[PDB]
Amino acid sequence: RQWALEDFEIGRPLGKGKFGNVYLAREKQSKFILALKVLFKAQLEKAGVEHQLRREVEIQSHLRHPNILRLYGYFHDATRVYLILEYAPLGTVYRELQKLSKFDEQRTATYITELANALSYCHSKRVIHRDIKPENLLLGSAGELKIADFGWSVHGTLDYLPPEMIEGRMHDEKVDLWSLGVLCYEFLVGKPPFEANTYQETYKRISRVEFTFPDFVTEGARDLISRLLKHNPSQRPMLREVLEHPWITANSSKPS
Ligand SMILES: O=C(Nc1ccccc1)Nc1ccc(CCNc2ncnc3oc(-c4ccccc4)c(-c4ccccc4)c23)cc1
To answer: Residues 76, 109: one domain?
Structure first.
């Protein structure tokens, strides 16, 4: 499988990513619908992220899960690199958040389950997704959550980063559980738990784990978030304890 630009009809712009635009597109021979991300050779070098992208592509084509976004392949011409992507009709959870303001406990729990599964499968394959955020959470046709962008994976706004990562310290799979906590809080409250107007100060909040709950947040939710957002990685739940959780299970529509 080696592609080229003329293999595809280019469709509407889907939106800007910080390193490239995305377009709907359709492979001419099969009429297969998909997303195509146009990245520039020049911008990629300048930031020293060209090797980062190779890592991703490599990592991605090892991965297959109903709740992870497929990468079908890649290719370059002179000026640019192209990522051939599974297309996610229902857009970002980020957009659904702004549209809805905040999610109810049923949508929240379901997403956490879908994320945990997806995250749980990744861990078993020795892979960590360093920065998960609502921008990187797409929806499928049935409304399934799909994690995007492994380009940071291993082994800008700070809201979703755990202490160990911002304190310039050493990090393990326990990173992702912090991210679950931040996401879980944000879904229910409608904005992330450390959010500030400065970087320097979001830095403090995250570092001190300094957050409080609006009053409409049930004990069950507080219990899970409180357990996920722990300063010490090793104190954070197993991905399965999350999947077991009595507020997850009482609320969630999807299996585990
Ligand atoms: O970008 C990297 N890695 C990387 C890149 C450069 C340097 C280093 C690493 N990975 C990466 C990151 C993000 C993506 C997601 C690309 N959007 C998408 N990918 C697939 N289907 C999609 O469908 C949509 C869609 C948009 C609006 C309305 C309805 C549907 C999008 C979409 C595109 C831009 C913004 C918001 C959503 C979308 C894909 C890959």
So the answer is: no
